[PDB]
Amino acid sequence: PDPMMIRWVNNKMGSVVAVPEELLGTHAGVVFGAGP
Amino acid sequence: DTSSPFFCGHFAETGSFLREGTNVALGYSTRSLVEYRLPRLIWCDGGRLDKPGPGNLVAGFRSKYLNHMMNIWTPENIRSSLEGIENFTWLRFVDTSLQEAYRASHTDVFARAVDLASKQNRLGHMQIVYDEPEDKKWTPVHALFQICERENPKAVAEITTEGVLRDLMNIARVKYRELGLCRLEKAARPRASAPPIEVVCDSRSAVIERENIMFHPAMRKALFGPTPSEIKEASFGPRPVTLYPPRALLPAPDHDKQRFTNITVPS
Amino acid sequence: GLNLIAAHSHIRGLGVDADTLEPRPSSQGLVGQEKARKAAAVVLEMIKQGKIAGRAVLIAGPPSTGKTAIAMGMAQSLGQDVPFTTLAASEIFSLEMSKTEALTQAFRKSIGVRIKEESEIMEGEVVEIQIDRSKQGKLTIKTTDMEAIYDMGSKMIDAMTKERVMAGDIISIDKSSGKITKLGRSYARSRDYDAMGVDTKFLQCPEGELQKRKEVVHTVSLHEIDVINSRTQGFLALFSGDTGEIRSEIRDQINTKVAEWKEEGKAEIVPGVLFIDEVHMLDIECFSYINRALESDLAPIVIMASNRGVSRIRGTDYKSPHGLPLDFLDRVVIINTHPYTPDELRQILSIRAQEEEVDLTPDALALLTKIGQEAGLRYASNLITTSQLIAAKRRAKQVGVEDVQRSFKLFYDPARSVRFVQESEKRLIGNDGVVDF
Amino acid sequence: LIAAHSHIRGLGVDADTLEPRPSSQGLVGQEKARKAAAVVLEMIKQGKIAGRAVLIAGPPSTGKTAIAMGMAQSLGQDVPFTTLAASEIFSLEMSKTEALTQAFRKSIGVRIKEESEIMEGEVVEIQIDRSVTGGAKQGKLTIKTTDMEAIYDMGSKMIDAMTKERVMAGDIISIDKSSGKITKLGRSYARSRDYDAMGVDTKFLQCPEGELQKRKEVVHTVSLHEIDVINSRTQGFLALFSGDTGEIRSEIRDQINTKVAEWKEEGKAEIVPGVLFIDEVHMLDIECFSYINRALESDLAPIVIMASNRGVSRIRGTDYKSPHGLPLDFLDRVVIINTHPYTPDELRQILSIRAQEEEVDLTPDALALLTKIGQEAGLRYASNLITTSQLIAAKRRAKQVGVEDVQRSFKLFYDPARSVRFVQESEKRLIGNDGVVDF
Amino acid sequence: ISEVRGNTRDHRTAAHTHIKGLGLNSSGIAEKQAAGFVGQCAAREACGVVVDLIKAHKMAGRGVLLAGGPGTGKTALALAISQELGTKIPFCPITGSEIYSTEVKKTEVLMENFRRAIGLRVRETKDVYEGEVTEMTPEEAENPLGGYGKTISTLLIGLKSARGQKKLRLDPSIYEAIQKERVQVGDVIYIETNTGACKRVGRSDAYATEFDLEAEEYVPIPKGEVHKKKEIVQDVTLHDLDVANARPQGGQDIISMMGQLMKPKMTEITDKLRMEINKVVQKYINQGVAELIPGVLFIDEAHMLDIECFTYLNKALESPIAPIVVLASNRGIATIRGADDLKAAHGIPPDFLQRLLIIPTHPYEPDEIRRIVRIRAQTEGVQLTDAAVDRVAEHGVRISLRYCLQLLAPASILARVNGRTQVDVQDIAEAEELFLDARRSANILTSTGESGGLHGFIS
Amino acid sequence: VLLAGGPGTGKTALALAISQELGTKIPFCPITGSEIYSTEVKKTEVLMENFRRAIGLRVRETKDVYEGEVTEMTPEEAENPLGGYGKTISTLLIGLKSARGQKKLRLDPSIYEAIQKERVQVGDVIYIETNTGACKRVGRSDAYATEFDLEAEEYVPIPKGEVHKKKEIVQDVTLHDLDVANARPQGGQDIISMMGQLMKPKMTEITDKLRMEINKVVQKYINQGVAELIPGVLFIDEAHMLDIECFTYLNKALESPIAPIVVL
Ligand SMILES: Nc1ncnc2c1ncn2[C@@H]1O[C@H](COP(=O)(O)OP(=O)(O)O)[C@@H](O)[C@H]1O
Ligand SMILES: Nc1ncnc2c1ncn2[C@@H]1O[C@H](COP(=O)(O)OP(=O)(O)O)[C@@H](O)[C@H]1O
Ligand SMILES: Nc1ncnc2c1ncn2[C@@H]1O[C@H](COP(=O)(O)OP(=O)(O)O)[C@@H](O)[C@H]1O
Ligand SMILES: Nc1ncnc2c1ncn2[C@@H]1O[C@H](COP(=O)(O)OP(=O)(O)O)[C@@H](O)[C@H]1O
DSSP states (O other), rough: OOOOOOEEEEOOOOOEEOOOOOGSGGGGGGTOOOOO | OOOOOOSSSBBBOOOOTTTSSSSOOOOOOOOSSSEEOEEEEIIIIISSSSOTTTTTTHHHHHHHHHHHHSOOSSSSHHTTTTSSSTTTTGGGTTTHHHHHHHHTSSSSSSHHHHHHHOOOOOHHHHHHHHHOOTOOOOOGGGGOOOOOTTOHHHHHHHHHSSSSTTTTTTTTHHHHHHHTTTOOOOOOOSSSSSSOOEEEEEEEEHHHHHHHHHOOOOHHHHHHHHOOHHHHHHHHSSSSOOOSSSOOOOOOSSSSSSSSSSOBBBO | OOOOOSSOOOOOSOOOOOOTTTSEEEETTSSSHHHHEEEEEEHHHHHHHHBBBEEEEEEESSSSHHHHHHHHHHHHTOOSSSSSSEEEGGGGSSSSSSSSHHHHHHHSSSEEEEHHHHHHEEEEEEEEEEEEOOOOOEEEEEOSOEEEEEEESSSSSHHHHTTOOOTBBEEEEEEETOOOOOOOGGGEEEEESSSSSSSSOOOOOOSSSSSSEEEEEEEHHHHHHHHTTTTTTGHHHHHHHOOOEEEEEEEEHHHHHHHHHHHHHOOEEEOOEEEEEEGHHHHHHHHHHHHHHTTSOOOOOOOEOBBBBBBTTSSOOOOOESSSHHHHHTTTTEOOOOOOOOHHHHHHHHHHHHHTTOOOHHHHHHHHHHHHHOOOOOHHHHHHHHHHHHHTTTTTTTBBBBHHHHHHHHOOOHHHHHHHHHHOTTTSSOOOOOOOO | OOTSSSOSOOOOBOOOSOBOSSSSOOOOSSSSSHHHHHHHHHHHHOOOOOEEEEEEEEESSSSHHHHHHHHHHHHHHHHSSSETTTTTOOOOOHHHHHHHHHHHHTEEEEEEEEEEEOOOEEEEEEEEEEEESSEEEEEEEEEOOOSEEEEEEOOOHHHHHHHHHHOOOHHHHHHBBBTEEEEEEEEESSOSSSOOSOOOOOOOOOOOOSSSSSEEEEEEEHHHHHHHHHHHOOOEEEESOOOOOOOOHHHHHHHHHHHHHHHTTTTTTEEEEEEEEETTTGSSSSSHHHHHHHHHTTTOEEEEEEOOOOOOOOOOTSSSSTTTOOOTTTTTTTTTEEEEOOOOOHHHHHHHHHHHTEEEEEEHHHHHHHHHHHHHOOOHHHHHHHHHHHHHHTTTOOOOOOOHHHHHHHHHHOOOOHHHHOOOOOOOOSSSSOOOOOO | OOBOOOOOOOOOOOOOOOOOOOOBSSSSOSSSTTTOOOSOHHHHHHHHHHHHHHTTOOOSSSEEEEEEEESSHHHHHHHHHHHHHOOOBBOOOBGGGOOOOOOOSSTTHHHHHHHHEEEEEEEEEEEEEEEEEEEEEOBBBBSTTTTOOOOEEOOOEEOOOOOEEEEEEEETTHHHHHHTTOTTEEEEEOOSSSOOOEEEEESSSTSSSSSSSSSOOOOOOOSSSSSSEEOOOOOOOHHHHHHHHHHHHSSSSSSSSHHHSSSSOOOOOOOOHHHHHHHHHHHHHHHHHHEEEEEEEOSSSTTTTTTHHHHHHHHHHTTOOOOEEEEOOOBEEEEEESSSEEEEEETTOOTTTTGGGEEOOOOTTTHHHHHHHHHHHHTTTOOHHHHOOOOOOHHHHHTHHHHHHSHHHHHHHHHHTOOOOSSSSHHHHHHTTSSSSSSHHHHHHHHHHHHSEEEEOEE | OOOOOOSOOSHHHHHHHHHHHHHHSSSSSEEEEHHHHHHHSSSHHHHHHHHHHHHEEEEEEEEEEEEEEEEEOOEEEOOOOSSSOOOOOOOOOEEEEEEEEEEEEEEHHHHHHHTTTTTTOTEEEEEEEETTTOOEEEBGGGGGGOOSSOOOOOOOOOOOOOSBBBBEEEEEEEEEHHHHHHHHHOOOOSTTTTTTTTSOOOOOOOOOHHHHHHHHHHOOOOOOOEEEEEEEEESSSSGGSSSSHHHHHHHHHSSSSSSOOEEO
């Protein structure tokens, strides 16, 4: 539930990036497929 | 037993411990015991050849007609001399513009370095992408004369699979780290420190000029970084926006235990 | 207007026939030096051909005979196309760069790179900035004839924001690079504000079409390419002078790429002329580099002047002809000059009269010819101005015998100054002692 | 490659009696100077006696630099050995005396010992939290050996090293905790079949056993000049490589000497005294000798060994002559070891060693002719004839070199004894101190 | 933009244009009138032995002297060796009057020229994804992390080169590239393999008209591959490694962005750096990756080096990694420039002279100057009759060698001005009085120039 | 004081005898005659720098440390209109927590930049030196101690005592140290004294006015009953290497009212 920190985690299966909900409306979600 | 070098300046001693209990405010009271007493006629009114006050009637005329009218770097005085054997012939081919040259020929070495700090290099990447025998070594015509910017072995070296040339281009750092010259305790230090000498001139203009030159908050902003309020308004917006310190332009200190100070802690 | 009548002002080119190379005597200022002018014409005709690389042409002779006159004649009779470089030898002895590099830069200036291109620029006065805060925008620009509305997408709106363009500016966009260059404001908005700022300069409106495309012929030198590639923002160094010992690997890369541009047909190399005036001031530490820099393909046809007879070479302690080492004089070709007959002296003084728009009676011209034969050219040419001025003080139109004799009485020629020094030795500080009467 | 002193493998004396062997370890053919250099080497290896001066005087091409390199190969890569030439001191950046002071202080090693903490094991997961448009970073690293399962934290520099190394899940990395370097040793799993820009499949190593936090005691040897440069400047480090050190004031050196004495008493550091070799010292002027005689007065001066070539020469910067070009207030301090010219039965075996080093096979008639040439033109012409005759024998496709190859090389390349006659014959087509003519 | 001219792509005539090599046999014996040279047999045989020594990699610090008078062919043999070795072996032709600097000591420019004379060849690989981006489409993970929003497991990029396009699945930590570099649809990028962080080159040329005014560089589509697995040979001189380790090129702070912004100063380099670089180059050679290639340091005019330089040259030549030093001296008994005491042969000290393989150079016979005139005349293209060749050979024997090779250009100019195509005796007899030699110049200087007066020279 | 006599007769043995007879707490500067020929400054500057190395001063100082553990670090920016640089942090609320009585203090921008170039997080013990403004981070406090760590931090306990300490020390400073301190400033938190320690250090020509003003400052120290002056020895070995431009200037260097004894 961090305000502006985007998490990357790489384990033995795969590697996923989690984005907080508070950044999807911002310009940081244009890459992740949310955008303004 | 902690220690520090001797201090030559004039600070402000605290009166007592039992008065300023909890909510106190530290003040930057560091001044030099060496003073230099100037009047308010030379330091403020008309003794400086740069301050355009009355009495110094030259300094406005000379400023305008040497920096903006009779200047060979203003864009009007470049646009007339760009068409042949003339002097700014080459300006079309260097990767600049008229506004780039006009900002580069009036700022400092400092502000020009801050302007270099937000320019993404691309002519090193041309040697990575456009690297075919059929491609005949393509360079943009508006960046043609920047030859040494284009053919650079470092840009090709930073891409290769084995780092056999990246272990040669910065072997000075590896030898400096492997000798333990960062974990070694600092043996020597200066025996006295001092603030810079200031002018004891008793006008308000002198204090304004001191807190705008000796501190000069534009260089402090360009050196230390952006405010967290600026980071919030630049990272919660709907569109990407730039920052005037795009990163903290403080250089990384090359001594890990004791950086930018002279204070010594026992161990 | 920063152009006043110097000594070398009547020499409008070399003044020889371009067909059969016949130096007719009174043509384009120069007078009666037929063999040296023919040899300079042969040199100039093998300069404009530009195939034969790296010669060296010494111009010997007595002083006050015309060795720099023929050099300025060769400089005027090339045009702005082929370069030329007036470098006296005392310019080389610097304190920021060594003699070898500051003499290499004399060779790197006299070779031009010529390239022809099309400049796709857009002048225009801003009328209304229209930003649609929805990214898009519209820019309205006008000239004295046209007016148009061009679309904008994302980022040059941010370039307008960083440039702070108001309604009334004169912007110019180089569409092949895409960067706004604000040229100032217009005279139609000088009535608007009252207390202007510092940075604002007023300009007329742009005229004609917005999209201007033009084929322009750029001509730079190799020294320009060397200094621009020295450091990052290094283009202002060649105006300022804040450059030093440029490494040889940069100049090697630049010569390789200029050869590559000549292969691909982009560039044309135009070799030029280096003029080393008074070459006897160079020491042997400079001739040992000139003897190697006249070997490469990229070396200009060097023309050098000299005055001295059998003199010592600076840096060493042995005499030599022309102040030059003999391993260097085995390499150059020498065009000797000769002193002037009075029939040439009279019309050289007539040309110096008609250049300075000073009218002379024939008796004054004959007297001035005799003074020039007895004292030299540089003293006789310095009496036309003085006689004109003394005639202007007593309000006479034509100068006469009286004004020239007055000018001869006041100012001393160098022939009588030596007798003035040797006449009174006890008061001039010779080497040890002064009497002081 | 094969330089002019690659056959030498030390000085070649005994360890118990230090008698000069007539043929041992390259330096073959001289006994007095090698025994005296063995005594000098033994009092350098003792390390007690400080501030001497050894002057290897003698004719040229007699093996003075060979004896110096013999002492250099005999100390190994432990004791510092500065190969200073006498012309390097005349700088334009710094003064002529401070270059000498740096040249002395480069030859006193300080050997310190410090404990680092190394890790070992298989990375299980990386967890990196990054900000948007500038800001700090957060990091959690889960690592597992065969025994422990740790979840460590990370700072900014550790993440800046992880992203530089691209440490994925399933890597055998070893992190120094103090210095902060990351060396991937290999992998335990295979390469995934889900991503494209992964990399190269590294070495297959198993999971390491033991413990995570292991300790290591490393030994670091720095000269006193490096300590002077890292303690003379606040931020301007790395100038001990790029030579950008302008001047170091005496307040810095007089503190570093005291702190190195304190490190010697505390058992932290050990002072290893070294050798300063000055090749062809006759080029220094008297302003250098007036400091070299007084820098050999303290406990932190290296044992100076230096060479010379000249007879009664005039000292530079003066107007008068002296033996070896050195002043007679400085020749009292020094101790002069003479070297002698060679004998042909020693030149034969020296050329045999130089021929066996450059992989050249000979015939005894060619070796006899080569020794006859080496009697009259020195070794410096004979070794060049060896290499040249090898390649001329390679051009005409012969196995071993012969008399004809040596005569060919002697005909093509003149020795200096014939180039002097070539100068003295044709004096009119050579630039003397005067003019020259052309036919 | 830049208009291309359809002219003739010729070349320029230097003083050593006709030299094309040594011109030897397959056994080393020289042959006269071959590859530009005329005669000069023993010097070309000895230089062929020197060329074989350089290409055989047995030279590790030799030194070769070229004696002989002025105008006999020392620099000609130097350029012949440089064209015989090729281009892939270095060649640094400095002069004696080029070590004197004003930023460093003059015994440092010598060592930097040694490091310019040594080359290092490195063979490596280059694995890059390349081209214009078509899609940036993410993919939702199978197990989203609780407490967050989007959870993206594999990021898809469609890269389109000029030959073929390709879909690419990537690890999601390419996002920090894409936000920081502002990569969009229509921007060419390259993705490396060792790290995997894409860097935008520019907007493509196909999208150069979707807008009207918003312009930047419009780079074209990469006309090549989409997956480069290309190997690279790379030649770096050791001078470049010394400079890049001493003064780093690209940093991210204020003071290194002032160091490259202010003028680059030559600084003296400490010997520990050179020792470390030699110790690591000799390790990468033993791994079998990099090849060391020694070259030639042709120090022309070797009598300008003073006695303080040969002392440093002895140390630098005793190093285990050093190129050959081909000196070039044209003096007899000369005073050495530094110490004005000893009159030594060639300007070289007698201690340094024993290292040198001294190659002589002899004057030319009076029937070989005309062969040099014929070769020089057919090099420039200036053709001329046989009596003209004999007159130029007469001027060559009686005056100088460099002077008979300079009566060919004004004779050709006066020939094609007078109205002919070939040079006759009249054109050379007319051009011999417009361009005097040094001898008649000294005769005019002494005879007519009696003393310093009005119409006289300044002695 | 001239020490004549031929070489090998013990001129400098007497000099080491004097330097071991005076003691440790008296300044003794041994130089040579070839040492003063520099390339940055004129040689009379090197002479005067040696003359003021050979004069010592013993000064008591009262340092005012704030030795705490940082509890809450929160910036408070001020108004910032359109002037190019943007926002600027102007006020803080750093809370220091010692063992006996915490404190919650407020800072200037410059002392915040002193914090900021030290990378002080929440938990780092520091002591703010309120003479310059400097503040050296010591380490993570032991209340946040964890053996599962990687940064190799130095865990120290909470500093006992009051958070606003005040301690006196004795310092041995020569007058040349004060000359170098006031010439090239390296103390404080402004820009001249921060960009002046990133450049390379150069010996410069400390003029007459600084060498007189520092004399008046030292006399102000002595009149407050704090500092003690202890003059010393300049031992110039090999004085014949000095040229006539140095023996000319030694006259005016010895005519000063404060000048150490010269032993040639
Ligand atoms: N042939 C000529 N016709 C006309 N003017 C000449 C001629 N020759 C020389 N002069 C004039 O005489 C002056 C001296 O010539 P210059 O070359 O300066 O002499 P010097 O070779 O001694 O420098 C010049 O100002 C030039 O204008
Ligand atoms: N006693 C020796 N043992 C081995 N090699 C020798 C000996 N004497 C001379 N040499 C060889 O002769 C060459 C010249 O020796 P060097 O010490 O360079 O002479 P100099 O002392 O005149 O400089 C060296 O390359 C060395 O290999
Ligand atoms: N063997 C040769 N064959 C043809 N031309 C030669 C020969 N030797 C010398 N030359 C010519 O002589 C001219 C001068 O010789 P140069 O190389 O300057 O002598 P140096 O080497 O003494 O300086 C050169 O232009 C060269 O073309
Ligand atoms: N009176 C003495 N007692 C003991 N040793 C002495 C005496 N005088 C001189 N020496 C010795 O002489 C050596 C050199 O003396 P030094 O003072 O360096 O000579 P100089 O006077 O030429 O400088 C020293 O090592 C010292 O041990």
